[PDB]
Design a protein around this ligand. Structure first.
Ligand SMILES: N[C@@H](CCC(=O)N[C@@H](CS)C(=O)NCC(=O)O)C(=O)O
Length: 101
């Protein structure tokens, strides 16, 4: 069940980016975490056999189906635009640090 695997992945990784391989928003979100020296897990929905079902479950969980859907410490933070805003505000690295602490 995709909803289970989603929950498993976000619980087992500090940062998860549900992504597609040719999405410019996703590339930007990867770039942001990379530039912060934060390790992330990428799930490429376009390469998964049931990625459509994953995208459905991400809609049900988060309220929207667009990629990227980004989780930090098991908490949905937004898409690419939200993540950049949270980073600009100094809200993102504290969430990353809760993970470890
Ligand atoms: N406002 C969103 C924009 C994301 C977005 O529009 N993503 C496109 C892919 S580039 C999308 O998900 N399109 C529909 C789809 O692939 O299902 C964000 O900042 O994350």
């Amino acid at each position: 069940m995709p909803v289970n695997q989603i929950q498993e992945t976000i619980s087992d990784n500090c940062v998860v980016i549900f992504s597609k391989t040719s999405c410019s928003y996703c590339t930007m979100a990867k770039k942001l975490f990379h530039d912060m020296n934060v390790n992330y897990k990428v799930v490429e929905l376009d390469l998964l056999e049931y990625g459509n079902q994953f995208q459905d479950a991400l809609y049900k969980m988060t309220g929207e189906r667009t990629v990227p859907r980004i989780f930090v410490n098991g908490t949905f933070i937004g898409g690419a635009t939200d993540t950049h805003r949270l980073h600009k505000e100094g809200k993102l690295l504290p969430l990353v640090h809760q993970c470890y602490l």
